[PDB]
């Protein structure tokens, strides 16, 4: 019987006795509560406000079934320090979520709760996407296997170069850089995240000079060529205007930053690319805003599951040894989450949940971030063939230019693969594999001298 007023959260939304269901979305929040706030309560606070609950008793709860539909907090795990930080385990039922809709899933498990005055802070670490939920998603329009068939590229990591300067280049100047790049041996060039269509360069002129340049070098090298054409846009109409022209040029591939565009804009895009045969390249532009800190945010790994179901052929994944941050073990974790069909609970890499994707295509991780020629066995050991590695400066900062920057990279990549294939240890011989491959490659040797002492290590 209905009684008006405030009660504790813990009473309905904390069930340490609950047995998760295979249908439950399983949330892992790293919670730093306020002084006084007990585990069980701030824990429950979290599940209520992300699901069905409210700060007071409301009568309409009687109209429906709380048991059938409430998010519960089912486990609290103590975490080192004081602090009094902890890991609170939350199960939301299937029924709470819009089918095929990252947007509904993030609004809800992450809409509001991070703003509770009643915490210091709060981070979403990991989310068990139940498979019955996966199945409601198209995900990537092609996937790892399919991309390789379509391009016919096998046995090695792939190679891209974002053009520079990021901004300020002409349409004609762009595909000048793109042609000199692709012909020297790169699988891809790209638009920087920043470029869409501006005063200095309107997209469709770009799309044009790039395509003339996509192909002049395909027929020159006898090798399939792409350039990431960014559809990313102000409005959804424009965004569709851009890949249509692409559809129409014959071009293998298009790009979209999914988080500044938004998962809605992205899903329409991954829907159109499957219906029109377009590879989808994803930048994670704007992530580190969401993901950088240990105590508050959303771990990149949620952001990469969420991209997998929204859909995309490639996602940047970190460089590890680069200018952008991303530690090894943690990075090895979300690359298999992007990639594999089943992923076992792995706490030391930060996989908090066994993740089954039951046949969803894999996304190819893109590495890219102030790396160059000497990082390439680190890169081919870290990712494995199943990756795009990508060289902006590392190609247009090569002293003899774009066709040689590109050569230096392709041989050094090839060199690591022959070396590996033949039984050599990429952690312990790669510096020498590069030295070796220098005698045989003058282009490589040139890019090796300019960049012989540039690390990034904090």
């Amino acid at each position: 019987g209905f009684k008006a007023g405030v009660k504790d959260y813990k009473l309905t939304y904390y069930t340490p006795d609950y047995q998760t269901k295979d249908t439950d979305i399983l949330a892992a929040f790293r919670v730093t509560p306020q002084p006084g706030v007990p585990p069980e309560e701030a824990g429950a606070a979290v599940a209520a406000e992300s699901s069905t609950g409210t700060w007071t008793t409301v009568w309409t709860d009687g109209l429906t079934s709380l048991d059938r539909y409430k998010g519960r907090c089912y486990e609290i795990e103590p975490v080192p320090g004081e602090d009094n930080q902890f890991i609170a385990y939350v199960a939301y039922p299937l029924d709470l979520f819009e089918e095929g809709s990252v947007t509904n899933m993030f609004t809800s498990i992450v809409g509001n709760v991070f703003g509770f005055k009643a915490l210091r802070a709060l981070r979403l670490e990991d989310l068990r996407i139940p498979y019955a939920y996966v199945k409601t998603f198209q995900g990537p329009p092609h996937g790892i296997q399919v991309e390789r068939d379509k391009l016919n590229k096998y046995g090695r990591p792939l190679l891209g170069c974002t053009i520079k300067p990021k901004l300020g280049l002409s349409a004609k100047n762009y595909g000048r850089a793109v042609y000199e790049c692709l012909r020297g041996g790169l699988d891809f060039t790209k638009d920087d995240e920043n470029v869409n269509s501006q005063p200095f360069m309107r997209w469709r002129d770009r799309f044009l000079f790039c395509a003339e340049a996509i192909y002049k070098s395909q027929a020159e090298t006898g090798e399939i060529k792409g350039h990431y054409l960014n559809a990313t846009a102000g409005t959804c109409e424009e965004m569709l205007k851009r890949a249509v022209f692409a559809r129409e040029l014959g071009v293998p591939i298009v790009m979209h930053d999914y988080l500044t565009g938004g998962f809605t804009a992205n899903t329409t895009l991954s829907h159109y690319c499957r219906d029109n045969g377009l590879l989808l390249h994803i930048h994670r532009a704007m992530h580190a805003v969401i993901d950088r800190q240990k105590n508050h945010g959303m771990h990149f790994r949620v952001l990469a599951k969420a991209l997998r179901l929204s859909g995309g052929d490639h996602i940047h994944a970190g460089t590890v040894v680069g200018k952008l941050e991303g530690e090894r073990e943690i990075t090895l974790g979300f690359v298999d989450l992007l990639r594999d069909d089943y992923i076992k609970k792995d706490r030391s890499r930060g996989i908090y949940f066994t993740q089954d994707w039951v046949s969803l295509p894999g996304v190819i991780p893109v590495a890219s971030g102030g790396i160059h020629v000497w990082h390439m066995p680190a890169l081919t050991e870290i990712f494995g063939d199943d990756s795009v590695l990508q060289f902006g400066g590392g190609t247009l900062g090569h002293p003899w230019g774009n066709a040689p920057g590109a050569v230096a990279n392709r041989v050094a990549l090839e060199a690591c693969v022959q070396a590996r294939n033949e039984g050599r240890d990429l952690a312990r011989e790669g510096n020498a594999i590069i030295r070796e491959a220098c005698k045989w490659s003058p282009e490589l040797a040139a890019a090796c001298e300019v960049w012989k002492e540039i690390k990034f290590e904090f």
Partner: protein, 123 residues
């Protein structure tokens, strides 16, 4: 400052930027292929050993991607020997063909390696 040539640099995907491998290396690529449980097969082509587009042109479409199959993928092969045997063999039937050694993964069901193993002579 050196110029990378705009003609005469036709390539063949993986390895094609390296010096041509000796048989010692060719058997070495096969050994890697067999060691990771993949399954070797030889392909070849006589007309058109590069990609073009004649029969349609839409995103994602190219011609020249398929070559011809040399017999059958070598299921139950164990000794990298047996790959070369067949390689030499296609060379004798067609000295002036292009020949690839390709390794099948059956679980992922994509080609896990693919490197050129013979060119004709002239082009």
């Amino acid at each position: 400052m050196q110029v990378w040539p705009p003609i005469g640099k036709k390539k063949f995907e993986t390895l094609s930027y390296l010096p041509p491998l000796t048989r010692d290396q060719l058997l070495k690529e096969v050994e890697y292929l067999l060691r990771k449980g993949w399954v070797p097969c030889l392909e070849f082509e006589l007309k058109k050993g590069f990609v073009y587009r004649e029969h349609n042109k839409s995103p994602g479409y190219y011609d020249g991607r398929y070559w011809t199959m040399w017999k059958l993928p070598m299921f139950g092969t164990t000794d990298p020997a047996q790959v070369l045997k067949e390689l030499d063999e296609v060379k004798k039937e067609y000295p002036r063909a292009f020949v690839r050694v390709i390794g099948f993964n059956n679980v992922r069901q994509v080609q896990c390696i693919s490197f050129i193993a013979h060119t004709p002579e002239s082009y």
